[PDB]
Design a protein around this ligand. Structure first.
Ligand code: HEM
Ligand code: IRV
Ligand code: PYJ
Length: 451
């Protein structure tokens, strides 16, 4: 019989996720129950997988396909049939996947690099301009970086996050829609009048996002400009299979999807990376030495960012410990037995990435230690042991983008500043649909290296 955490009568396990930190709650359950536990909610059953042994099987795409978790299903209300919230069998998935893959390749990063540098330099400049008495709100600034980077590379839009403390109206709505999607996970009687105004606000936020993104698309189509951004690629792309381009609605969903992905999901990586760097000065020194040796020019080149191997290891080790897209869902395409012990019927598994990444049978007993050297040789990483970007054809299309922007800015941060964990910050991971070291603050003392 499969382990299952404590239940709450008719609510089954659902109230276990009625907590500020559900991923961490699930990790704790995984620690207690092991590599697989059943999680039941009213009208839902899933099985949380935490071991590489089981997850490797779940990642067999011949047996399991991506499932929309309840979170993804609720985000689908505004991310539509964008790539993240589409089922693999939906026409728009493969179509957009085929169209967008070349826009997200490592080679495509060469084209986004200058725009990424634009924002990265703004980040560096912000911190260069802080007064000595001041500190950095790390996740906030990382989000400024990542949001602005995806805005610029996504559709040549400047969110200008370094010019405001208040979020862009689209982001206000996106964050509130994501929050409402996450809140609806715990909503008994959704059509109750208590959650009534949440619905009105949710629809208003969906409309804000649609109107703003639709206007972006329409403005680009009307202007005819051919930027080297994702929007241009989507407006001009043709899926070789169907022969079809994405329609404007799906492009809007893709843009919404990229903005969600490139917001705190991506900035969390940077925030956790910097968190671990300041908590592990030996690592920081090693990463800083690489940044200093490699980033010999006032602005990093693409080729230099590629040489930031140890920065990449830092990022991978941050992704190991706190993958900011911490779970993905799969479903059994047919009846199948998982791991020789768990018969599954056709039709859900949750891959609990932080737990996979703590599988001592893969990583050794020191799984909680931040040791980028674990990633010194990518050959040492067994298949499916490390899956911060998900799996297979449903893996993160933005992986190279996220890692390039993260490596670039982290490299620049490490080149340009020494960092002080001046509050001896106690890791407190705030959960939305992503993870963030909430309140993580540092001081950055400029090395006074010009840009
Ligand atoms: C550190 C940053 C990121 C992490 C950890 C991450 C993680 C993931 C994961 C785990 C998935 C699979 C989700 C699932 O199976 O349900 C995914 C999918 C996806 N991600 Fe990311 N992501 C990141 C950044 C980005 C960025 C910056 C973009 C685009 C601008 C992006 C776009 C996507 C898309 C479009 C998909 C769906 C791909 C498909 O199913 O065809 N992600 N991401
Ligand atoms: O699975 C996802 C959401 C997946 C989204 C990650 N993602 C995908 C693409 N980009 C990011 N949360 C986990 C944990 C959870 C549970 C309740 C409330 C919040 C979070 C789960 O549902 O058990
Ligand atoms: C677009 C990334 C995403 C989508 C839904 C939920 C969380 C994260």
């Amino acid at each position: 019989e499969m382990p299952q955490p404590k239940t709450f009568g008719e609510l089954k396990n659902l109230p276990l996720l009625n907590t500020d930190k559900p991923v961490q709650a699930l990790m704790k359950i995984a620690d207690e129950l092991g590599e697989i536990f059943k999680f039941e909610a009213p009208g839902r059953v899933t099985r949380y997988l935490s071991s590489q042994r089981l997850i490797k099987e779940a990642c067999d795409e011949s047996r399991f396909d991506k499932n929309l978790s309840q979170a993804l299903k609720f985000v689908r209300d505004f991310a539509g049939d964008g790539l993240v919230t589409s089922w693999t069998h939906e026409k728009n998935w493969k179509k957009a996947h085929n169209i967008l893959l070349p826009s997200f390749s490592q080679q495509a990063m060469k084209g986004y690099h200058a725009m990424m540098v634009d924002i990265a330099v703004q980040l560096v400049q912000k911190w260069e301009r802080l007064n000595a008495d001041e500190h950095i709100e790390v996740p906030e600034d990382m989000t400024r970086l990542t949001l602005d980077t995806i805005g610029l590379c996504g559709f040549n839009y400047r969110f200008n996050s370094f010019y405001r403390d208040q979020p862009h109206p689209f982001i206000t709505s996106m964050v509130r829609a994501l929050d409402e999607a996450m809140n609806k996970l715990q909503r008994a009687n959704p059509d109750d009048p208590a959650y009534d105004e949440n619905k009105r606000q949710f629809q208003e936020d969906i409309k804000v996002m649609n109107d703003l993104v639709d206007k972006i698309i329409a403005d680009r189509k009307a202007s005819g400009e051919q930027s080297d951004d994702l929007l241009t690629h989507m407006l001009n792309g043709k899926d070789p299979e169907t022969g079809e381009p994405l329609d404007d609605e799906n492009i809007r969903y893709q843009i919404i999807t990229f903005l969600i992905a490139g917001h705190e999901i991506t900035s969390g990586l940077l925030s956790f990376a910097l968190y671990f760097l300041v908590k592990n000065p030996h690592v920081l020194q090693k990463a800083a030495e690489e940044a200093a040796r490699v980033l010999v020019d006032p602005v990093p080149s693409y080729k230099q960012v590629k040489q930031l191997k140890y920065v990449g290891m830092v990022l991978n080790e941050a992704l190991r410990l706190w993958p900011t897209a911490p779970a993905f869902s799969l479903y059994a395409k047919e009846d199948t037995v998982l791991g020789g012990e768990y018969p599954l019927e056709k039709g859900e598994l949750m891959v609990l990435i932080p737990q996979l990444h703590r599988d001592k049978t893969i990583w050794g007993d020191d799984v909680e230690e931040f040791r980028p050297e674990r990633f010194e040789n990518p050959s040492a990483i067994p298949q499916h042991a490390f899956k911060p970007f998900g799996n297979g054809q449903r893996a993160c299309i933005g992986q190279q983008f996220a890692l390039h922007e993260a490596t670039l800015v982290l490299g620049m941060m490490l080149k340009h500043f020494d960092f002080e964990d001046h509050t001896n910050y106690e890791l407190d991971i705030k959960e939305t649909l992503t993870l963030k070291p909430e309140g993580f603050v540092v001081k950055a003392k400029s090395k006074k290296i010009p840009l």
